[PDB]
Amino acid sequence: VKELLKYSNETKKRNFLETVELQVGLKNYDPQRDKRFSGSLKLPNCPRPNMSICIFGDAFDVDRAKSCGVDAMSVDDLKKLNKNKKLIKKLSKKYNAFIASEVLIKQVPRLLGPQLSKAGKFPTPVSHNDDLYGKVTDVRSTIKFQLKKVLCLAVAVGNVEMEEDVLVNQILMSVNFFVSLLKKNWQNVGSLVVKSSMGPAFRL
Amino acid sequence: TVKTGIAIGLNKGKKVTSMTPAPKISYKKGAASNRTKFVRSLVREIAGLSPYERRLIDLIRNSGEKRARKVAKKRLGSFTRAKAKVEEMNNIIAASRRH
Amino acid sequence: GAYKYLEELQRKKQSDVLRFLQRVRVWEYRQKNVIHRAARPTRPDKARRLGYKAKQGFVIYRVRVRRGNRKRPVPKGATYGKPTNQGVNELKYQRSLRATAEERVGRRAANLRVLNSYWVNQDSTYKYFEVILVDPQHKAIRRDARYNWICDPVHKHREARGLTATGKKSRGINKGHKFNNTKAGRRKTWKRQNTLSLWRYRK
RNA sequence: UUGACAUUGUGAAGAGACAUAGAGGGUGUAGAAUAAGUGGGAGCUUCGGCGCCAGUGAAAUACCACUACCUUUAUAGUUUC
RNA sequence: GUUCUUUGUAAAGUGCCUUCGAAGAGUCGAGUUGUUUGGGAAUGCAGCUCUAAGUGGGUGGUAAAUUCCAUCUAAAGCUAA
RNA sequence: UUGACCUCAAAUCAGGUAGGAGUACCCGCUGAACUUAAGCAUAUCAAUAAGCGGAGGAAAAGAAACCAACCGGGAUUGCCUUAGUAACGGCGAGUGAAGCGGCAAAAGCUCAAAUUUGAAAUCUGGUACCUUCGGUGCCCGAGUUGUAAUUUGGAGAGGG
């Protein structure tokens, strides 16, 4: 189980030889086809910090600009509409709201090809800002399948504790197992190869 | 399960005090036992598979279980027998090739 | 016991091991006679569940029967009737190969009162079975509160009638609403509802 | 009579998928350059080679999970004719 | 009814607890061929091909997926009226 | 060389048993046509006659891999009811059941599957006598490729 090997727990804290903070991936095995319907395309909601410092571009106005300097990243306003229009893309993702959908008419010319903007297919506009910040920096895992039957994502860090990250890969063993369509194969939880970025892989 | 005490209802019947005695020996005829479990796997390593069971495991490991149930149903009988058959061969693929 | 092992072993005939042993013995019976006496039973596990005791009066027999169907014995194909009634090669039998083989070995050894039998081999041209018969002549079997019923004329040629397992499965002496037409005495029961009975009084 | 399957097996060559680990090459113009190409990346590392805050395009490289498109590229076992 | 041999370091019956606890395979079923039948997506029965399992399998009179309840125990046999 | 084991033999050896008859009533397989449909091809007749094989005094069957959906019944059969109904069917002519209720009659069970293994304790035949449908001494063989004892699901056994 998850209590034995590392997985996202204990064992791999004697295997890392780096000084920096890196995020590990979790490889699963789920047989699917080449069509456009079979797959687990959701957003596995994690509880505690993943410490992945993916600096944002939060632009809020009035009393939403003040509740942006505790758990979130960059604190912006509605005056910063001509700020990132040029060529600067120093943000992994952004986050608008109720007072930024009217100001969502001039932040569309330079975010089309990749699409890191605030649309209506991947949750960006919310009036509850200090609630969805513990879901983007804590990481609510971004998913989108390609062509074959395998899939990787993101959990948390390994320079923390053991029973505090055992609830991070807990609501992931039941998130990529549910959205995983009824057009799949034998076992939706099988081959487990957990490689970080320096050391070996442990299996369950 | 208790009744409605009336003619019909979700419980069509009479409200009578149930006695329920000790059940028969003719209920556990699906019981395996250490006598059978033992010999069953012993003679299975001696007899093994067959030609249809060989390309049956290479059908799963090569394609899938939806396709393997689609073969053994025309190879055998019911979809109920197909479910049971694949459960068996998969404990031999995982517990032999890896363990 | 070897019986528990030999029993489940003869359930996985789809294995390369049994099909080699088979090939050897099937050729063996094929190099013999159509009807001959087998010294020792090949399946004492199946033989013992039928009622087998090793000693005097226990005759084991081997039958080399042909397969296919029953071609009507009409010369040239000569019928005379209706097309629905005019079948020739789509003709079967109301009896199984097993049952029928026992009947031919009984026309041979009539002093014996055959028990039953089981399948042993088969290729395509022939089918093979291992029969068991008992002789109510020996005082060893004549007495004994296990076979007393055999020595009586009520058990003289059970296979000739179908008082045997295979014949009672074919004759359909089973319990059920599916075997209602032939619960016990198909013809007697048939003739039973086909009977117009009236009492001294017409109700 | 003709096809099908049972009967009905042991091999050899020749084409041939597959389970598997290594390897390998593809956007021609720009960016001295090898782009369907995603996420982590300021370092992995006794070097520093590239980097990179920088820059150009339809698309940024060692740190590459291979999650990949792909290989009639070499095989440890089976396979269709 | 009267009478002779002690059946016997024989066996049967019950009460409490523990471990267990084996129940018939070229059979079941299925497809199809034909036949019988009150049997209707196939009533039984025989052929040939395929070819079972054990919290299992048979049946619940409409085939089927799916999650279930009922209900018993085939593939051995014997018995008067 | 001597002695077994396996399998297949020989005799006017020993001791046995089979065929054929009958066939009113019962158990199988094979199997019609006529008739009717105002014709006649499915159908009906009929799962009948004849034919081939097997018994007894009854015979076969039978203690549920049942019938039900009840406050469930509870081996076989027969009769009354069901009901001439459900269903079947050129949906035509026609054919064609069952559980139940009532009642007569009433019977139960045993073999494989298990280490007797501190003991093949089991049984045939010869032969001696006898208390002669049978008992018992002695000798062969059966037979350990499994005979008694025990136990068959309703249980039940190894143990205490």
Q: Would you say A181 and A20 are in contact if contact means Cβ atoms under 8 Å apart?
A: no
Residues 79-118 on chain C lying near strand E, CB distance under 7 A: 84, 87, 90-98, 116, 118
Q: Is the dihedral of CA A178, A179, A183, A187 positive or negative?
A: negative
* Structure tokens that stand for C170 in this block: 């074919």
Residues 127-166 of A with CB under 7 A from strand D: 145-152, 154
Helix (H) or strand (E) holding C118: strand C113-122
How many inter-chain contacts (A to B, CB under 8 Å) are there? 8
Residues of chain C in contact with residue B53, where contact means CB-CB under 8 angstroms, are 14
H/E run at residue C189: helix C186-193
Three-state secondary structure string covering A115-147: CCCCCCCCCCCCCCHHHCCCCCCCCCCCCCCCC
What is the Cα–Cα distance from C39 to C45, expressed in whole angstroms? 16
Enter the tokens of residue C130.
């291992």
Q: Which domain holds residue B57?
A: 16-99
The chain A residue lying nearest B67, using CA atoms, is A185
**Could you give the 3-state DSSP secondary structure of residue C167?**
helix
What six digits make up the tokens of C58? 């226990």
Q: Report the C-alpha gap between A105 and A115 in whole angstroms.
A: 15
Check if A123 contacts B (Cβ < 8 Å): no
Provide the residue count of chain A. 204
Nucleotides of D under 7 A from a protein CB: 6-9, 18-19, 36, 39-45, 53-56, 58-59, 63-69, 78-79
Contacts of B82 (CB under 8 A, 6+ apart): B69, B72, B73, B76
Helix B79-97 crosses helix B51-60 at what angle (to 10 degrees)? 80
Tokens of A139: 């990481």
Give nearest nucleotide to A93 (CA–C1').
D39
Q: Calculate the CA B48 to chain-centre distance.
A: 20
Q: Please indicate, yes or no, if residue B8 is contained in any of the structural domains.
A: no
Whether B1 is in a domain gets the answer no
Side chain identity at C188, as an amino acid letter?
Answer: K
The answer to whether residue B9 sits within a structural domain is: no
Total number of domains constituting chain C: 1
| Whole-angstrom distance, CA of residue A105 vs CA of residue A58 | 16
Q: Is residue B76 within 8 angstroms of chain C, CB to CB?
A: no
Give dist(CA B76, CA B78) in Å, integer. Answer: 7
CB B92 within 8 A of CB B57: yes
d(CA C69, CA C91): 6
Assess contact for A152 and A25: CB atoms under 8 A.
Answer: yes
The residues, any chain, with a CB within 8 Å of residue A76's CB and separated by 6 or more, are: A57, A58, A59, A60, A65, A68, A83
Q: Which residue has its C-alpha nearest to nucleotide F62's C1'?
A: C184
Per DSSP, the three-state class of A76 is strand
| Nearest-by-Cβ selection for B48 from C5, C8, C15 | C15
Burial of A95 (0-12, 13-18, 19+ CB in 10 A): buried
How many B×C Cβ pairs under 8 Å?
27
CA C130/CA A127 separation, integer angstroms: 86
Q: How far is C23 from chain B (nearest CA, A)?
A: 16
The alpha carbon torsion through C178, C184, C188, C193 (nearest 10 deg) reads -40
Strand partners, C126: C66
The whole-angstrom separation of Cα B81 and Cα B83 is: 6
Residue C202's SS3 state is: coil
CATH number, position B73: 1.10.10.1760
Q: What is the resolution of this structure in A?
A: 6.1
Residue A97 — φ and ψ, nearest 5°? Answer: -155, -145
**Token pair belonging to B15:** 């409200």
What are residue C4's phi and psi, to 5 degrees?
-65, -35
Q: Is the dihedral of CA C91, C96, C98, C104 positive or negative?
A: negative
Helices (H), chain A: none
**The pair of three-digit structure tokens given for residue A142, joined into one six-digit string:** 């971004």
Q: Name the residue with tokens 């390593």.
A: B45
- Ordered alpha helix ranges (H), C92-185: 97-106, 139-142, 148-151, 165-170
Q: Which residues contact residue C12 at a Cβ distance below 8 angstroms, ignoring those fewer than 6 apart?
A: B43, B44, B47, B50, C18
**Inside any domain, residue B7:** no
CB of A186 within 8 Å of a chain B CB? The answer is: yes
How crowded is residue B72: how many other Cβ atoms within 10 Å of its Cβ?
22
Using alpha carbons, list the distances in angstroms from residue C126 to A27, A60, B22.
59, 91, 52
Residue among B90, B60, B61 nearest B69 (CA): B60
CB contact under 8 A, C17 and B50: no
C169 touches strand F (CB under 7 A): no
- Selection from A29, A44, A25 nearest residue A167 by Cα: A44
Closest residue by C-alpha to C1' distance, nucleotide D55: A87
- Distance between CA C130 and CA C117 in Å, rounded? 5
Q: How far apart are the first and last CA of chain C?
A: 67
C170 touches strand E (CB under 7 A): yes
Phi-psi region of C63 (alpha: psi -120 to 50; beta: other; left: phi over 0): beta
Statement: the CB of C178 is under 7 Å from strand F: yes
Give a yes or no: residue B52 inside a domain: yes
Residue matched to tokens 């939880």? A189
Q: Is A73 exposed, middle or buried (0-12, 13-18, 19+ CB in 10 A)?
A: buried
Instruction: Give the pairing of strands C58-66 and C126-134.
Output: antiparallel
DSSP, collapsed to helix, strand or coil, labels residue C131 as strand
Query: How many angstroms separate the CA atoms of C9 and C27, rounded?
Result: 22
Are residues A185 and B64, on separate chains, in Cβ contact within 8 Å?
A: yes
The conformation of residue A161, written as its DSSP 8-state character, comes to -
- Please tell me whether any atom of strand D lies within 7 Å of the Cβ of A192: no
Non-local CB neighbours of A99 within 8 Å, separated by 6+ positions = A60, A61, A62, A64, A78
Q: Name chain A contacts of B64, Cβ cutoff 8 Å.
A: 31, 185-186
Across the interface, whether the CB atoms of B40 and C8 are under 8 A apart is answered yes
Three-state secondary structure call for residue C99: helix
User: Which of B61, B65, B86 is the best substitution to test chain A (most A C-beta atoms within 10 A)?
Assistant: B65
For residue A194, the tally of other CB atoms under 10 A from its CB is: 22
Q: Which of A177, A129, A173, A190 is CA-nearest to residue A8?
A: A173
C-alpha to C-alpha distance for A126 and A118, rounded to whole angstroms = 10
Q: For chain B, how many residues are written?
A: 99
Distance of CA A101 to the CA centre of its chain: 23
The whole-number Å distance from A197's CA to F72's C1' is 70
CB A71 within 8 A of CB A134: yes
Beta strands in A13-86 (DSSP E): 28-29, 58-59, 75-76
Radius of gyration from C-alpha coordinates of chain A: 19
Residue C77 three-state SS = helix
CB distance A31–B64 less than 8 Å?
Answer: yes
Cα A173 from chain centroid (whole Å): 16
Question: What are the start-end ranges of the H helices in chain B?
Answer: 34-42, 44-47, 51-60, 65-75, 79-97
Give, in degrees to the nearest 5, the angle at Cα A67 between A61 and A68.
80
Question: H/E/C letters for each residue in C2-71?
Answer: HHHHHHHHCCCCCCCCHHHHHHHHHHHHHCCCCEEEECCCCCCCHHHHHCCCCCCCEEEEEEEEECCCCC
Residue B23 DSSP one-character state: P
Q: Which residue has the tokens 């079997």?
A: C141
Query: Is the distance between the Cβ of A88 and the closest atom of strand D smaller than 7 Å?
Result: yes
Q: How many CA atoms lie within 13 A of B15 on its CB side?
A: 5
Residue C18, domain CATH: 3.40.1120.10
C121 φ, ψ (degrees, to nearest 5): -145, 175
Q: How far apart are CA A65 and CA A62, in angstroms?
A: 6
Residues in chain C with CB shorter than 8 Å from the CB of B52 are 14
Under 8 Å between Cβ of C113 and C131: no
Both structure tokens of A172: 């992931």
Q: Which helix (H) or strand (E) holds A150?
A: strand A150-151
Distance, CA of A6 to C1' of F145, in Å:
59
Q: Tokens 């689609």 correspond to what residue? A: B70
CB A42 within 8 A of CB A36: no
Residue from A137, A109, A122 nearest A23 by CA = A137
Query: Is there a contact between C57 and C141 (Cβ–Cβ < 8 Å)?
Result: yes
Q: Which residues touch A74 (CB under 8 Å, ≥6 apart)?
A: A55, A56, A57, A58, A91
Instruction: Say whether C122 sits in a helix, a strand or coil.
Output: strand
Q: What is the tally of structural domains in chain B?
A: 1
Are B50 and C14 within 8 A, CB to CB? Answer: yes
Range of the domain at C131: 1-203
- Taking Cα atoms as reference points, which of C11, C17, C5, C29 lies closest to residue C129? C29
A37 inside 8 A of chain B by CB: no
CA distance C112 to C110: 5
Chain C residue at shortest CA distance from B40 = C8
* CA dist., res. A78 & res. A62, Å (int): 9
Distance separating alpha carbons of residues A17 and A158, to the nearest angstrom: 13
Q: From CA C45, how far away is CA C2, in angstroms rounded?
A: 8
